[PDB]
Amino acid sequence: AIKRGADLIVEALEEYGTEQVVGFIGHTSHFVADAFSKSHLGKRVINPATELGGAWMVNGYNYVKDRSAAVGAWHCVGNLLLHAAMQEARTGRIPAVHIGLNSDGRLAGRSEAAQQVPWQSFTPIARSTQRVERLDKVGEAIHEAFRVAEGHPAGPAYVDIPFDLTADQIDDKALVPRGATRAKSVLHAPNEDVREAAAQLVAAKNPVILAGGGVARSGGSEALLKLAEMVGVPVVTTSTGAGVFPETHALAMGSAGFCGWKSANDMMAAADFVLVLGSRLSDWGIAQGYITKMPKFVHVDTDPAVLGTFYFPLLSVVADAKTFMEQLIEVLPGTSGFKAVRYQERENFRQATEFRAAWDGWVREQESGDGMPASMFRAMAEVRKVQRPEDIIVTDIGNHTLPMFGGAILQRPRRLVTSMAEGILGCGFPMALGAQLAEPNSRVFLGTGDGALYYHFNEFRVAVEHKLPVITMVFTNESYGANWTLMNHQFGQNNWTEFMNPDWVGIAKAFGAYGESVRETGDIAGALQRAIDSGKPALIEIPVSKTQGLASDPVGGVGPNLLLKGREIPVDTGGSMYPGENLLHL
Amino acid sequence: AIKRGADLIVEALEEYGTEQVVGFIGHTSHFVADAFSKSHLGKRVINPATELGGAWMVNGYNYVKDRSAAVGAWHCVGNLLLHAAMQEARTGRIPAVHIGLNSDGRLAGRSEAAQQVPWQSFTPIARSTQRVERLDKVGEAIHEAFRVAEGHPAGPAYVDIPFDLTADQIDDKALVPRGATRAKSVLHAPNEDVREAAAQLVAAKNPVILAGGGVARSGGSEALLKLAEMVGVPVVTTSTGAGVFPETHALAMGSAGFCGWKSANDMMAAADFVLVLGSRLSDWGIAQGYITKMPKFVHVDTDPAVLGTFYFPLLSVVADAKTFMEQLIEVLPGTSGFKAVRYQERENFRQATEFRAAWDGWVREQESGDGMPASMFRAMAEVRKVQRPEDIIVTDIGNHTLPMFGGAILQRPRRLVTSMAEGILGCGFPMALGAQLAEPNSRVFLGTGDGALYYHFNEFRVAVEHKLPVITMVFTNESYGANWTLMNHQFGQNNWTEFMNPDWVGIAKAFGAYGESVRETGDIAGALQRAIDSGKPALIEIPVSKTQGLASDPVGGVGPNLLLKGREIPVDTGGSMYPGENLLHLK
Amino acid sequence: AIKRGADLIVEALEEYGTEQVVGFIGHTSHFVADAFSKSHLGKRVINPATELGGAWMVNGYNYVKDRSAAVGAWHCVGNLLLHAAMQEARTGRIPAVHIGLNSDGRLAGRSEAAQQVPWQSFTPIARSTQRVERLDKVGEAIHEAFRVAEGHPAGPAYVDIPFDLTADQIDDKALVPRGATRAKSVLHAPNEDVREAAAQLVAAKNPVILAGGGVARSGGSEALLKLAEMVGVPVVTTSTGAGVFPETHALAMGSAGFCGWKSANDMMAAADFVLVLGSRLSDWGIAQGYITKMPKFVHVDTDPAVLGTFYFPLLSVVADAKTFMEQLIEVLPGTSGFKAVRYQERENFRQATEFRAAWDGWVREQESGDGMPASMFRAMAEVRKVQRPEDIIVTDIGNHTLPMFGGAILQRPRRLVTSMAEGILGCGFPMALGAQLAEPNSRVFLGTGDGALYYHFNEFRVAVEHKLPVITMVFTNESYGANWTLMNHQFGQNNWTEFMNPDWVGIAKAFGAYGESVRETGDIAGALQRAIDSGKPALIEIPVSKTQGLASDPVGGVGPNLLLKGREIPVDTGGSMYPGENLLHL
Numbered sequence A, C: 001a002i003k004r005g006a007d008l009i010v011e012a013l014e015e016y017g018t019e020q021v022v023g024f025i026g027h028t029s030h031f032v033a034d035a036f037s038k039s040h041l042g043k044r045v046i047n048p049a050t051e052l053g054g055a056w057m058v059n060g061y062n063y064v065k066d067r068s069a070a071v072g073a074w075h076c077v078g079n080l081l082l083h084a085a086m087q088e089a090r091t092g093r094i095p096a097v098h099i100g101l102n103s104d105g106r107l108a109g110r111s112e113a114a115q116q117v118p119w120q121s122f123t124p125i126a127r128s129t130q131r132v133e134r135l136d137k138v139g140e141a142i143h144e145a146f147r148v149a150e151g152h153p154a155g156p157a158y159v160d161i162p163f164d165l166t167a168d169q170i171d172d173k174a175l176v177p178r179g180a181t182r183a184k185s186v187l188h189a190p191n192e193d194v195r196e197a198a199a200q201l202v203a204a205k206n207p208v209i210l211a212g213g214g215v216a217r218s219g220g221s222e223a224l225l226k227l228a229e230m231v232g233v234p235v236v237t238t239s240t241g242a243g244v245f246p247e248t249h250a251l252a253m254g255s256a257g258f259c260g261w262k263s264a265n266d267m268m269a270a271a272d273f274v275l276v277l278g279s280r281l282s283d284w285g286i287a288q289g290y291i292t293k294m295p296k297f298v299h300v301d302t303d304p305a306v307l308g309t310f311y312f313p314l315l316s317v318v319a320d321a322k323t324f325m326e327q328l329i330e331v332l333p334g335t336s337g338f339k340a341v342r343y344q345e346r347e348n349f350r351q352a353t354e355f356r357a358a359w360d361g362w363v364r365e366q367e368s369g370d371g372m373p374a375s376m377f378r379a380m381a382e383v384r385k386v387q388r389p390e391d392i393i394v395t396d397i398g399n400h401t402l403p404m405f406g407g408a409i410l411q412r413p414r415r416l417v418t419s420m421a422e423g424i425l426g427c428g429f430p431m432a433l434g435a436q437l438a439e440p441n442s443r444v445f446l447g448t449g450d451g452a453l454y455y456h457f458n459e460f461r462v463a464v465e466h467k468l469p470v471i472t473m474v475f476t477n478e479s480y481g482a483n484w485t486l487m488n489h490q491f492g493q494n495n496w497t498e499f500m501n502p503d504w505v506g507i508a509k510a511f512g513a514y515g516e517s518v519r520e521t522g523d524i525a526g527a528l529q530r531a532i533d534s535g536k537p538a539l540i541e542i543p544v545s546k547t548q549g550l551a552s553d554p555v556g557g558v559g560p561n562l563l564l565k566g567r568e569i570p571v572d573t574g575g576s577m578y579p580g581e582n583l584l585h586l
Numbered sequence B: 001a002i003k004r005g006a007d008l009i010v011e012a013l014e015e016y017g018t019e020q021v022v023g024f025i026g027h028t029s030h031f032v033a034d035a036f037s038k039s040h041l042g043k044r045v046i047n048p049a050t051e052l053g054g055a056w057m058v059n060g061y062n063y064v065k066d067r068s069a070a071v072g073a074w075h076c077v078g079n080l081l082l083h084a085a086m087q088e089a090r091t092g093r094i095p096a097v098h099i100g101l102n103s104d105g106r107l108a109g110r111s112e113a114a115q116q117v118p119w120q121s122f123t124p125i126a127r128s129t130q131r132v133e134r135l136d137k138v139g140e141a142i143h144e145a146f147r148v149a150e151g152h153p154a155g156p157a158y159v160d161i162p163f164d165l166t167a168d169q170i171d172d173k174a175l176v177p178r179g180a181t182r183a184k185s186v187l188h189a190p191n192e193d194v195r196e197a198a199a200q201l202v203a204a205k206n207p208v209i210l211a212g213g214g215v216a217r218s219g220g221s222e223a224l225l226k227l228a229e230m231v232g233v234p235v236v237t238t239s240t241g242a243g244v245f246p247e248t249h250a251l252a253m254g255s256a257g258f259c260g261w262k263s264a265n266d267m268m269a270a271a272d273f274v275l276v277l278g279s280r281l282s283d284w285g286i287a288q289g290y291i292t293k294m295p296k297f298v299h300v301d302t303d304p305a306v307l308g309t310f311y312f313p314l315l316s317v318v319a320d321a322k323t324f325m326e327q328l329i330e331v332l333p334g335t336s337g338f339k340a341v342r343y344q345e346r347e348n349f350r351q352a353t354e355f356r357a358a359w360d361g362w363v364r365e366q367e368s369g370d371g372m373p374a375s376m377f378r379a380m381a382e383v384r385k386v387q388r389p390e391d392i393i394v395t396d397i398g399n400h401t402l403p404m405f406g407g408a409i410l411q412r413p414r415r416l417v418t419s420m421a422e423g424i425l426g427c428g429f430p431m432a433l434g435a436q437l438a439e440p441n442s443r444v445f446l447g448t449g450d451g452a453l454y455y456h457f458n459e460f461r462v463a464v465e466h467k468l469p470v471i472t473m474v475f476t477n478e479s480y481g482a483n484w485t486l487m488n489h490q491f492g493q494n495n496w497t498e499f500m501n502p503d504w505v506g507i508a509k510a511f512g513a514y515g516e517s518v519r520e521t522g523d524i525a526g527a528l529q530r531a532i533d534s535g536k537p538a539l540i541e542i543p544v545s546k547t548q549g550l551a552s553d554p555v556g557g558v559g560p561n562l563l564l565k566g567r568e569i570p571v572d573t574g575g576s577m578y579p580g581e582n583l584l585h586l587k
């Protein structure tokens, strides 16, 4: 059948499992938008305030789905706004396909052309960058983008299509590849690696299992609970792994790292052996700026590139996390030294429970005060009174990230959302909208700084139009508080940190959202209940300190080193001059 | 003397003429911010709501100054938001230096590193992209950045500095290059070319001078006025040249192009000869999608790369526009055929004045009407009543661009501001703020669509804190109106075009800005007076139709061709298969 | 200890298993060459005639080793000659680390600098491109290069080091990473994939096992012989898999593809099911220009990116080849329908043996003629009379490639060498020298065209100095014979194809190599024996036809389509003009 390129693009996106489009109109996306209007997927299009806001919504949707279920589709020059969000998808292992419609290919390469988008600016960012030259390659390119996006590692794929190809027509026989099959990701380890790992776990005096985001992608929660109880081993997570192990269990230490739980950092400092499952041991994760001292460890991952890149394991294993744990459960009864004892009667139990109790007491101290400015831990304690086990906690980047991580106590995977890998400010609100779109049975609570909310609160248009009842707490300190704090630690003086806020309640009201300020009432619990009862997206303005959280609160961190001290650098004495130095020798 | 890298960056920036810093804090920019607080640049730093809004401020400031007087200074990952504004600077010839402070160079190349910014993403965009490896190269790199940014062509330069270098210390002797004097840009044409141009000008029956943005950069307004009156030749501009020739003058046809003045398009369709000065004859400018048919022309530019790239001139000349005009004024009295008479007495005068009068009549007609929605031409007629020669008009991108260009009548250079080269939606508000910062005692009027204002109205934080009294008209139609209109033509139905607006008056009030709606009153005139009296940034809501402007209004355009008709493309029958086609051959 | 950067580079290369250096002097490599002179590896440095010749020697050495045992080390501007060889390492999955010493970092970025090498020219080619900015990163960068080079997929890694860092000195504590461990590559499939594959193999009427170069990298020869005999299934290979199955066995069909064995192409056209082990199903391999019609197939690979990129399998499996075959052997006795029958009594045996016999008869016809010009199959039959099972057959690219592939009958893996993935002319001689260096118990026979030998016969300097007794047959036709042939098929006329040859015997004698021409004697067997007895590198000049081989001989190929027919292309009628068209409208 003769088909337009725009209709072939839509067909391909449906074939590969696209649920949700985030698209922006312009003459280069006109044919694609027309084609979407005639398709099932046309019913699910978000038109965001900006393309960067929309790209963040793709990230939040796909982070919780672990596939490229949301897809961006962008008129030419709007693609120039994608880079920040695309970079987070790359290091954060978020599958994300983006289709950029460039200007007419007839006008490419002309020096005085308008809106000829430099697609090679994505080459250092996307896991796959393709410029499509020919209509008969449009299906093939989209198939490749999905294959790359949803691989191991997951990430972003960008497809640049000059829009004349979307108007042009071709007979469609076999053009969109169909019948594609994926290999299973249930990679099994060899027996001798399993037996080694089991022997180490049993022999250790103070073992720990470290579960990262790969345990969530693997689906390994059940196996992890069984394995931890069978061996009697405390569980530490990364921030993307939090919730794969129920955080109210006796063995749950929470997340390690610099915005994590001190019980987890205590346990990592005490441990003599770690089994690492589905973690990349990253800079702002377990590595803490490449300062953390890892105990002897076994490292299990589906991506060999993460294994031994920086931390050298006792043993590196290419295997699926759930599968490896199931293999361990099978081998453990025939492992020398193994005895079936209830985890509460193991010799290591009391130490772990003491670390957790100390942390819980510290959290109770942070949360229990009343009045203004509010503690962000109090705010989170109020959220946990109204929180369901499928609900999603979202945060932005700043001082506030620490209380959001520390006050989230989670029972399910992929419930904690932010720009985890890159720490890009402003992510929180639009990522929360994308997560809400993906998870309509989840209540979504966002704790955002004021500096952060400034970036993409324009997306209240989307929240209101699409009836997305995200509950946003804006923590107001009229500051980039992390930076106020750190600059005063570093220099004794802040600069570039302070700003005004609008009347946020007035902003919410102007968009037809629910708005309330607790500046005078302190009534966080009441405001949460009113916001939930509204059925609308909500904005609760909560005054906070400039200093509480990431840049101040002691959670057992060692890094990262970002207040670095300068070194004195030898000049070059080889004889060559600086530019303009010739004038000094006259 | 031992200096930190941060201090050396500030010293270099000062040496090369920086007046205004737009900066964003984060740990990688901490040392730089601390160093700026010790400088006379520290006082005035703008900390924008987002880095892309700030980069648009840099572009508005520098577009009106014609030098990189504003600089950006950005914490690592905030650099990832620069690319759209940087691309406008590249094709739009805006000088702009951006200093990106990357994460620690010790951590670079590690696969699981955080915030290691891919500076090579700028390589296809900036005129110059540099990654600094060594502290002793920090001065040198910044010197090079200004050299490129302020050359011919002007454009953006990006410098990536791992921030450990900003903390490190070194002895400063000769490290910051000082004391350069740049080459003059008053490039003179060969006398033979000047003579040839004068001979064509005099011989033509219906000549036109086409003056682009290079006449503004050249400072050629006085020479152009003398030349045009001496020969008695109508003046057409580009959108970046508008205002180089006073648009109240009887010879002024306005700007040619598809959002231009029909008088200018009529003139260019009538002309038998054009002298093109300081124009790149661009796609969304004079070329209108490479459809415009140029008469025989002489082309004068400082950048050889624009001369003969697409339109082949009769004669191409590498020269400065003001200089070339001065040369031609000197030779004209000795040119065979030249007659010294008042321009009003020339045979070609009446036709030009007729084009202008017809256009002015049409504009008057668009200003008329008595209710709601309002005409955007009416809105511009009201702005003209309160507009001085030094005042700046800013637009965003959409249907509203055509009435803003058609209602702006300018008499000085560099008074009309937008994302000219790239058409990037959202530019208007933050570029207006940057123009206001560059010219604190000029009044700045912005006409913006509602889809446009959505992008960077967060920068009301900057406008209110810095008391930048931009007067913004937001034209409300609850739509991407250009697209609503074009898609209804193309397909019979719009899609992806309609959206909710907030209460814009309420948004302004929540920031402490002046706000008013004319929806019930029609009182644009009073709203402009109240907005001006407020001394605050102001927002005037004006409801408009979905259709008025770029997608509907006839201005004599021929292009561009964006409502494409597709072609039917043949399938490859050479034998090779599609992916997956193997399954279709199984029996 | 305080150490120079040059000494740290040497230390790192030794730590990661480097055996052989190929290096080129210049002031930027002076410190590195001095450092090598003080080390164990210093004893194994080849200084090639050119850097491209040397890069090809790295490729040949590492192709047969399946690790980056050879390493290039190059003065600045000589790195500009590496790209061709580097591209073959990338698509050909050859591990190869190259260390480029750039000019002084103090002079980088200056517009009028000399010898500042654009290392970003490698970014689209190498699997890893790194520019080292800091002395304390030199060890770390080399460790990363090896990790990437020796991964799955294998490939080239380029490290650019400004040479001032190689003169500079630093305390060495922990700078060169030591104690690195690799994960095993014995990835196991899940049982249900094993059982599926076994059920298909047993149920098929006319199965085939297709073994590619991954069976060689895996070490799977023993398991493949067992599995093929147990199930009674003919074996087809790719050109990089040839020799993993003994090519004299009754079940051996040889290599499929356009320069392969017709028995293999016949068997692929007859088969109802294929088990593909360690093949990427590539363009100039099994795909034959994306024309080959694959039967229903199971696809087993360690690199998920190859699985389902173009040919969509019944089932895709991420697993090691040897391991998967061992899993199949274990499952087969409990697979429904399986009976233990001698392979000679299976119903499919006679068909396979008939295909092989037809091919063998055709080869005997090609080889059996005497006189001049010689048949290249006769030449290969003479080599097989003097060939040991560890000996290596090398070819260049041209008409001659077909008789070299067709006359090679191999018993061991990694014995057939050329620029397999990219077909880059001139590879053969320097790749043969690298293979000889790696495999000193192998006699190396190169069959090269004349056009090919022209590129790197300057490397006779290396062959003679290092006493590398490669036996080179130069097939002389005074032509780019493939192109003479194909152009006459395509157009009825050749152009740019014909050239003179030097007196090749005189060239060999001038270098102190053994030289002989059979132009008048026909005495190929005698010349081989004299060349072997010399103990020297040898050059035997053998006149051949312009047309025999790749461009003419029918081996059951279907592709690739490189004599493509042009299509008539619609002009653009949108209204926009061409450059300069304005003058036509005046």
Ligand SMILES: Cc1cc2nc3c(=O)[nH]c(=O)nc-3n(C[C@H](O)[C@H](O)[C@H](O)COP(=O)(O)OP(=O)(O)OC[C@H]3O[C@@H](n4cnc5c(N)ncnc54)[C@H](O)[C@@H]3O)c2cc1C
Pocket: A091, A092, A093, A152, A153, A185, A211, A212, A213, A214, A215, A217, A218, A237, A238, A239, A240, A241, A255, A256, A257, A258, A259, A260, A277, A278, A279, A280, A281, A282, A283, A284, A285, A286, A300, A301, A302, A303, A306, A319, A320, A321, A322, A397, A398, A401, A419, A420, A421, A422, A423, A424, B114
């Ligand atoms: C301000 C800020 C503070 C932060 N504080 C912390 C903190 O305190 N603690 C913390 O942990 N992080 C923190 N982060 C997040 C951190 O930067 C990283 O994003 C995070 O630690 C990475 O988690 P991960 O190692 O589990 O790997 P992910 O990025 O989640 O990657 C998943 C890993 O699992 C592997 N994998 C995927 N599927 C499978 C499978 N089926 N089987 C096996 N392996 C699989 C992948 O190959 C990869 O190695 C912070 C971020 C910011 C911005």
Ligand SMILES: Cc1cc2nc3c(=O)[nH]c(=O)nc-3n(C[C@H](O)[C@H](O)[C@H](O)COP(=O)(O)OP(=O)(O)OC[C@H]3O[C@@H](n4cnc5c(N)ncnc54)[C@H](O)[C@@H]3O)c2cc1C
Pocket: A114, B091, B092, B093, B152, B153, B185, B211, B212, B213, B214, B215, B217, B218, B237, B238, B239, B240, B241, B255, B256, B257, B258, B259, B260, B277, B278, B279, B280, B281, B282, B283, B284, B285, B286, B300, B301, B302, B303, B306, B319, B320, B321, B322, B397, B398, B401, B419, B420, B421, B422, B423, B424
């Ligand atoms: C929606 C929309 C509508 C638009 N409609 C129009 C329209 O109707 N008409 C229009 O003109 N544009 C229009 N534009 C703008 C258009 O895209 C271009 O930005 C503009 O036309 C370019 O102007 P220019 O040719 O003068 O060159 P500029 O981009 O201003 O560049 C300056 C030129 O002068 C040269 N130069 C610089 N200094 C000197 C010197 N000293 N001497 C000599 N030469 C010098 C430079 O090398 C260059 O060639 C529109 C843009 C948009 C987004």
Ligand SMILES: Cc1cc2nc3c(=O)[nH]c(=O)nc-3n(C[C@H](O)[C@H](O)[C@H](O)COP(=O)(O)OP(=O)(O)OC[C@H]3O[C@@H](n4cnc5c(N)ncnc54)[C@H](O)[C@@H]3O)c2cc1C
Pocket: C091, C092, C093, C152, C153, C185, C211, C212, C213, C214, C215, C217, C218, C237, C238, C239, C240, C241, C255, C256, C257, C258, C259, C260, C277, C278, C279, C280, C281, C282, C283, C284, C285, C286, C300, C301, C302, C303, C306, C319, C320, C321, C322, C397, C398, C401, C419, C420, C421, C422, C423, C424
């Ligand atoms: C002139 C010319 C003619 C040619 N003619 C032919 C021809 O007739 N026939 C032919 O086959 N080729 C031919 N080639 C070569 C062809 O271009 C390819 O180089 C070759 O076919 C690729 O072989 P392969 O598919 O086995 O993959 P390779 O390139 O050998 O790659 C190895 C594959 O095995 C996988 N792998 C690696 N280790 C393992 C493991 N442990 N377990 C499982 N999988 C593993 C890899 O991921 C990869 O997919 C020709 C080349 C030229 C230049």
Ligand SMILES: Cc1ncc(C[n+]2csc(CCOP(=O)(O)OP(=O)(O)O)c2C)c(N)n1
Pocket: A396, A397, A398, A399, A400, A401, A423, A424, A425, A426, A448, A449, A450, A451, A452, A453, A475, A477, A479, A480, A481, A482, A483, A549, B024, B025, B026, B027, B051, B075, B077, B078
């Ligand atoms: C795009 C971008 N710009 C700047 C930063 C640097 N940064 C990291 S945290 C932070 C403070 C954010 O302020 P806010 O949201 O108010 O949170 P608070 O620290 O006050 O809790 C900043 C500016 C960044 N990570 N990303």
Ligand SMILES: Cc1ncc(C[n+]2csc(CCOP(=O)(O)OP(=O)(O)O)c2C)c(N)n1
Pocket: A024, A025, A026, A027, A051, A075, A077, A078, B396, B397, B398, B399, B400, B401, B423, B424, B425, B426, B448, B449, B450, B451, B452, B453, B475, B477, B479, B480, B481, B482, B483, B549
């Ligand atoms: C970043 C970006 N996204 C999309 C476009 C496409 N576009 C061009 S004009 C326009 C309409 C803008 O709407 P608005 O500001 O309301 O103006 P109106 O057409 O209603 O006057 C759009 C979406 C663009 N140029 N840039």
Ligand SMILES: Cc1ncc(C[n+]2csc(CCOP(=O)(O)OP(=O)(O)O)c2C)c(N)n1
Pocket: C396, C397, C398, C399, C400, C401, C423, C424, C425, C426, C448, C449, C450, C451, C452, C453, C475, C477, C479, C480, C481, C482, C483, C549
């Ligand atoms: C570097 C490079 N240049 C050109 C070619 C194109 N090419 C492929 S085969 C061939 C013929 C080689 O001639 P020769 O070595 O004499 O072999 P013959 O065809 O005569 O057997 C040529 C030129 C190539 N593959 N690589």
Ligand SMILES: [Cl-]
Pocket: A026, A027, B423
């Ligand atoms: Cl547009």
Ligand SMILES: [Cl-]
Pocket: A423, B026, B027
């Ligand atoms: Cl940050």
Ligand SMILES: [Cl-]
Pocket: C026, C027
């Ligand atoms: Cl040299």
Ligand SMILES: [Mg+2]
Pocket: A398, A449, A450, A451, A475, A476, A477, A478, A479, A480, A481
């Ligand atoms: Mg804050």
Ligand SMILES: [Mg+2]
Pocket: B181, B182, B183
């Ligand atoms: Mg100069």
Ligand SMILES: [Mg+2]
Pocket: B398, B449, B450, B451, B475, B476, B477, B478, B479, B480, B481
């Ligand atoms: Mg609008």
Ligand SMILES: [Mg+2]
Pocket: C398, C449, C450, C451, C475, C476, C477, C478, C479, C480, C481
């Ligand atoms: Mg030849």
